[PDB]
Design a protein around this ligand. Structure first.
Ligand code: FAD
Ligand code: XAX
Ligand code: HPA
Ligand code: FES
Ligand code: FES
Ligand code: BA
Lengths: 760, 450
């Protein structure tokens, strides 16, 4: 089955509406619904809390203070504490101080507002400049990694370019909002939730209730999107549900409304990047000097590992002899930023892509040629390393870019625009190529383990269960395709179970694009074990070596005789051979020192390239993509179709982050963009009018599941292409350096045209 | 109170005891879990349902739709798109084949939205599916799907709904409305409900005394009069855009980008006007083409120019018992142009809305009608800039020479959608655009071919 363009595990159930998400799920007539009461102050001591009108509001069955919580008031993924209900003080506008439990969802949302809270407000850290000046930061100082001596390279670099640019945040906008249901199954609880990470939900609920882990069970069939948001910010609702369930004796469900969701929960860390990049007269980089200022928010969340990935990807796609990052983990009284597709990679990589571009324009060289000249060497006695010193011997970017530019007709179109530009005076076209080098695996390396559990029933039909969770990436499809591949049976015969902590325990988050890689291996292990059992039994029963029992096309063959897979299982049942097996996998070769900034964090890297064409109106700044040409490397793809899709959407979302999506706070830490009306993700007509996504088909150098390559996060970084092309459009206006900022909204685009033109 | 309708083939009657309960509510409460929740603000079409009546089949957001509106209609939800025998709509299959699914959440919305397009044989998927948004796939798979599903014959079972039927006031005649609204001044009027329902779902507000104008055919009228065209306050934007196509290709072009197709089917012109928004996109167009409004205080009829209707912010020339009845726009307005500007093109609140319409007499500017949305807290015409342009040459430099007068006409605001500087700057930019476009320049960014 592996390598077929088969459809998503629920594509029909999807398209007919019968796919059921948390809020869709049936439940008892007494199920109460919960709502958070949110702080309106950015940095205050709560000196008055009268929840009298809240309790008296109708439908209200229970209303909760931090003081009411029986155990651990913590949801943080970090060993650093983050309360669920505010403890004595508030740290950002939107912090849940209390929790209503009402007979209807509507009713609780109504009662949530009826609170009488008197705050004693303190000064508030809102901008990075403040945070940095007030020493409002995490980890106790910045992290500083250096390869060689940058200072010395830049001293005598033939060409050097310095700059400083803003990179805004990003809201997730998963169509299914954060959601959880608690069910008090006597003794312990059962949690159903729209979560990327069931096992931490287990951990967090367990602690909040005060019962050992074996009493909390988390089931998870699907999500309406995850993108990093559901990788932690589930804990809050799942704690809220289990704590209220425990207390009210009833089953308690909780789901945010879009308005709550954006206000309460954290987004993509906005960055500021200062770059000092230098080269020689030939074009080969002498070294780059980076400073990251990261907007982590009022709480740790996943800020630590996020900024580690940012620094790891600070090499973009290029070999640099001397590289230094100084990464600041700043705290502000805003939302606790979390994980998001790319997990910081996009941010560090964009700073390298802005530096390399600014250098190109400066020395008056074509960026594509300067990037081509500065890639990592293709494989096949000293292999180049990264700034963290990991050997890069799997880099196909030489070939890939050459492959893409030829197919995308890159040179003709860029010259074709030159003429189009000189004919126009109101509209300008732009075009840029962007490379992707993205390391695959968990930064924190012990999370690199995945588990499975496969049943084979007497009618032949198997039941699949792993630790990975479905958010739409088509994970189960790949698992089914692997499972059917290994047993030599039709993928029909493989059925997928909902993700369970009681089926596969001690899961990691379904994150870092690892999901398909490691679980694939996990599935394959259990399947091979079972397939071995059946083979051994046959070769005994049929007289011969198990090696010679071939399992294929739902048929078993041995001794020159053949049975259906069904017939062989029933017999091995009758023989009393176990048809249930677990499967486990832990990623090999991984070892690095975070604080040192040395070692091999990644098993391998995923590559790709994107050429984007755009138009800009010089008068207002209005913009749109016209064409996109992608050639992403998926290794030997587990599902060609599914992968191509991922790459399409990852790019659209990538570009969406650098274009129309913009997060805005007022002078009080109030998120002004807290609805779909004011946060503008890419809408239908925004799709690249000509959208060519092609795969790079070449087996992975490393021993991954069927030579595949984790395709989740990497193709997000293709969106850079559009931001660069938009800058290439601005460059066409005047002789000056535009200094385009992320996001490149019509206003921010005009402001770059304006600079190139030499105005204000 | 009782209303009946056709829910997915079955004939259903319902007892209205709460008139303001949305249709999204009703369905999910009833069990129709296939319709989903995305925000209850209309922006993401996760709940696009299909309705049908004497007019034809239309795609709407169930979260903006109050039950007493679907009275007498034919409703089709996602769980009822496929054939009763079990066969999938050509849309459902094409979407399976062309992988229009990843997380599956927005899928019900699109299916319903595409199905209604498929039924009415519509193909402008760009504008048509602009309502329901998806985070996951990048729309390209959906666009392939919709084109493949296009070739297949219409769903004959969905077609069968056409034959159907052929406490909270619901009028049937415009008189009967003025009649009732004469005695109930403090009554919450619901036309399309695309702004009133955001007070109930988001702002959580209770409103006794309600009247659905969405059942007064004589209030929703296109009628030709000697002077021009008499558009009734009940006319829906989709239809207003559809009617403009001929006489006003410029107004249609703006109305293209008015909300989504979902909201355009139910949102009305007189609703948008009587709403009284400064970031309202209806007025500036109508005000730049000098269209007279019409009010009714029972048997009373006032008829002022639309600019006069808006005095202060949130304060309008409405009298207790008075309501918007119709608007009157003259036959032709060849010099009119409308410029909407926002972060994203489709379905967004415009930061600046530039409406310009002059006459020539060779080269000299005759009558200038320059009007703006979002520039000051009320849709008003730019006087100082306008007075400067009249009786002057229609060249770039002269128009550039009076641009600073707009900074005396308005002093814009600075929210999350634009900094005053840029809002002001783009306002000026729209005037240069107008002189360029009219001289035959390539100015439109949306019109550029890849
Ligand atoms: C998703 C979404 C997108 C939107 N996009 C846009 C947009 O692009 N451009 C824009 O300008 N607005 C937009 N709006 C807001 C806009 O105000 C309404 O959607 C619409 O224009 C109003 O028409 P309606 O028929 O829905 O009126 P309703 O919402 O029914 O009425 C709104 C107000 O007008 C009053 N009213 C309505 N009709 C009459 C009448 N005949 N006589 C007296 N009073 C009346 C009502 O009592 C109420 O106070 C959008 C709203 C949403 C939810
Ligand atoms: N349709 C769809 N595709 C998606 C996502 C989604 O929500 N919906 N999310 C991601 C993310 S975000 Mo991350 O480290 O948590 S920050 S990991 C990750 C991811 C997970 O899928 P594996 O590669 O593990 O199988 O692919 C992407 N593709
Ligand atoms: O790469 C990652 N992605 C998500 N979470 C993580 N935690 C450590 N590394 C990662
Ligand atoms: S609720 Fe999301 S648009 Fe109807
Ligand atoms: S498929 Fe995930 S939101 Fe549309
Ligand atoms: Ba979020």
């Amino acid at each position: 089955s592996v390598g077929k363009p088969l459809p998503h595990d629920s594509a029909r159930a999807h398209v007919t509406g019968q796919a059921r998400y948390l809020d869709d799920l049936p439940c008892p007539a007494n199920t109460l619904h919960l709502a958070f009461g949110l702080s309106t102050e950015a940095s205050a001591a709560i000196t008055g809390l009268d929840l009298e009108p809240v309790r008296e509001s109708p439908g209200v069955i229970a209303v909760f203070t931090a003081a009411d919580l029986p155990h651990d008031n913590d949801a943080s993924p970090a060993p650093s504490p983050e309360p669920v209900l505010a403890t004595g003080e508030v740290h950002f506008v939107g912090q849940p101080i209390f929790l209503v439990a009402a007979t209807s969802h509507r009713a609780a949302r109504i009662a949530a507002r009826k609170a009488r809270i008197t705050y004693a407000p303190r000064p508030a850290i809102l901008t990075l400049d403040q945070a940095l000046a007030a020493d409002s930061r995490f980890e106790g100082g910045p992290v500083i990694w250096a390869r060689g001596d940058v200072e010395t390279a830049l001293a005598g670099a033939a060409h050097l370019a310095e700059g400083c640019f803003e990179i805004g945040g990003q809201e997730h906008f998963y169509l299914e909002g954060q959601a959880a249901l608690a069910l008090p199954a006597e003794g312990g609880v059962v949690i159903h939730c729209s979560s990327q990470h069931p096992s931490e939900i287990q951990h967090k609920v367990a602690h909040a209730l005060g019962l050992a882990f074996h009493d909390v069970r988390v089931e998870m069939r699907r999500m309406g999107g995850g993108f990093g948001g559901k990788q932690s910010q589930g804990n809050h609702l799942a704690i809220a549900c289990a704590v209220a369930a425990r207390a009210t004796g009833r089953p308690c469900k909780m789901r945010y409304d879009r308005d709550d969701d954006m206000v309460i929960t954290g987004k993509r860390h906005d960055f500021r990047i200062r770059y000092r990049i230098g080269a020689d007269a030939s074009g080969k980089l002498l070294g780059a000097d980076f400073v990251h200022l990261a907007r982590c928010g009022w709480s740790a969340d996943l800020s630590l590992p996020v900024c580690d990935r940012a620094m790891l990807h600070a090499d973009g796609s290029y070999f640099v002899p001397a590289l230094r990052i100084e990464s600041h983990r700043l705290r502000t009284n805003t939302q606790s930023n979390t994980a998001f597709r790319g997990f910081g990679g996009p941010q560090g990589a964009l700073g390298m892509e802005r530096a390399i571009e600014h250098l190109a324009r400066g020395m008056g060289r074509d960026p594509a040629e300067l990037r081509a000249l500065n890639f990592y060497d293709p494989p096949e006695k000293k292999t180049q390393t990264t700034h963290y010193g990991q050997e890069v011997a799997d880099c196909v970017l030489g070939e890939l870019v050459t492959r893409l530019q030829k197919s995308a007709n890159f040179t003709t179109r860029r010259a074709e625009i030159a003429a189009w530009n000189s004919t126009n005076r109101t509209l300008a076209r732009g075009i840029a190529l962007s490379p992707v080098k993205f390391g695959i695996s968990f930064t924190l390396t012990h999370l690199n383990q995945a588990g499975a559990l496969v049943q084979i029933y007497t009618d032949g039909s198997v039941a699949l269960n792993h630790g990975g969770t479905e958010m739409g990436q088509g994970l189960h499809a790949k698992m089914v395709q692997v499972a059917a591949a290994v047993l030599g049976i039709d993928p029909v015969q493989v059925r997928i179970t909902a993700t369970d902590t009681s089926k596969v325990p001690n899961t990691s988050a379904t994150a870092a694009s690892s999901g398909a890689d490691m679980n694939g291996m996990a599935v394959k292990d259990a399947c091979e074990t079972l397939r071995g059992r059946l083979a051994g039994f046959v070769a005994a029963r049929e007289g011969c070596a198990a090696r010679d029992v071939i399992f294929d096309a739902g048929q078993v063959q041995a001794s020159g005789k053949s049975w259906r897979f069904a017939e062989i299982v029933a017999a091995a049942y009758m023989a009393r051979i176990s048809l249930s097996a677990t499967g486990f996998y832990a990623t090999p070769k991984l070892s690095w020192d975070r604080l040192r900034g040395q070692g091999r964090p990644f098993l391998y890297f995923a590559y790709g390239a994107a050429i984007t064409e755009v138009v800009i109106d010089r008068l207002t700044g209005e913009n749109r993509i016209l064409r996109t040409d992608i050639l992403h490397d998926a290794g030997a793809s587990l599902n060609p179709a599914l992968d191509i899709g991922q790459i399409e959407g990852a790019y659209v979302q990538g570009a969406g982050w650098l274009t129309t999506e913009e997060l805005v706070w007022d002078h009080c830490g109030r998120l002004m963009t807290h609805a779909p009306s004011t946060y503008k993700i890419p809408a239908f007509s925004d799709r690249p009018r000509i959208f060519n996504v092609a795969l790079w088909d070449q087996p992975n150098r490393e021993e991954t599941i069927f030579r595949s390559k984790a395709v989740g996060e990497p193709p997000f970084l293709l969106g850079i292409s559009a931001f660069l092309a938009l800058h290439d459009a601005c460059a066409a206006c005047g002789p000056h350096w535009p200094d385009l900022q992320a996001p490149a909204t019509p206003e921010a685009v005009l402001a770059a045209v304006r600079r190139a033109e030499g105005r204000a | 109170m009782e209303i009946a309708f056709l829910l997915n083939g079955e004939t259903r009657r319902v007892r209205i005891e709460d008139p303001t309960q949305s249709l999204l509510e009703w369905l999910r409460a009833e069990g129709l879990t296939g319709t989903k929740e995305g925000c209850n603000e209309g922006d993401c079409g996760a709940c696009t349902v299909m309705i049908r009546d004497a007019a034809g089949s239309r795609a709407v957001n169930a979260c903006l739709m109050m039950l007493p509106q679907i009275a007498g209609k034919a409703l089709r939800t996602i769980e009822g798109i496929a054939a009763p025998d079990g066969r999938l709509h050509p849309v459902q299959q094409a979407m399976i084949d062309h992988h229009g699914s990843q997380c599956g959440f927005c899928t019900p919305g699109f299916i319903v939205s595409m199905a209604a397009a498929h039924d009415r044989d519509r193909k402008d998927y760009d504008d048509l599916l602009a309502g329901n948004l998806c985070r996951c796939t990048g729309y390209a798979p959906i666009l392939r799907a919709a084109e493949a599903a296009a070739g297949e014959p219409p769903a004959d079972w969905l077609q069968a709904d056409a034959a159907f039927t052929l406490p909270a006031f619901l009028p049937e005649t415009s008189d009967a409305l003025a009649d009732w609204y004469l005695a109930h001044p403090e009554a919450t009027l619901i036309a399309g409900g695309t702004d009133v329902s955001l007070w109930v779902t988001k702002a959580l507000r209770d409103l006794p005394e309600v009247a659905f104008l969405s059942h007064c055919k004589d209030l929703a009228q296109i009628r030709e009069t000697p002077d021009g065209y008499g558009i009734g306050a009940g006319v829906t934007i989709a239809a207003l855009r559809a009617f403009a196509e001929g006489p006003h290709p410029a107004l249609a072009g703006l109305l293209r980008r008015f909300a989504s197709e979902q909201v355009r089917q139910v949102a009305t012109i007189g609703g948008n006007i009587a709403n009284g928004s400064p970031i309202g996109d209806g007025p500036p167009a109508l005000i730049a083409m000098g269209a007279s409004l019409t009010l009714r205080r029972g048997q009373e009829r006032r008829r002022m120019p639309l600019e006069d209707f808006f005095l202060e912010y949130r304060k309008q020339d409405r009298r207790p018992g008075e309501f918007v009845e119709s608007v009157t726009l003259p036959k032709s307005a060849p010099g009119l142009r409308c410029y909407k500007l926002s972060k994203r093109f489709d379905q967004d609140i415009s930061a600046v809305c530039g409406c310009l319409n002059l006459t020539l007499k060779g080269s000299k500017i005759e009558t200038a009608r320059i009007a703006f949305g979002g520039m000051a807290g009320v849709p008003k015409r730019a006087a100082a800039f306008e007075a400067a342009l009249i009786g002057q040459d229609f060249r770039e430099d002269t128009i550039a020479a009076a641009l600073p007068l707009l900074a005396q006409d308005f002093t814009p605001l600075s929210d999350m959608r634009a900094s005053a500087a840029y809002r002001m700057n783009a306002a000026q930019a729209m005037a240069l655009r107008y002189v360029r476009e009219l001289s035959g320049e390539a100015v439109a960014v949306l019109e550029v071919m890849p």
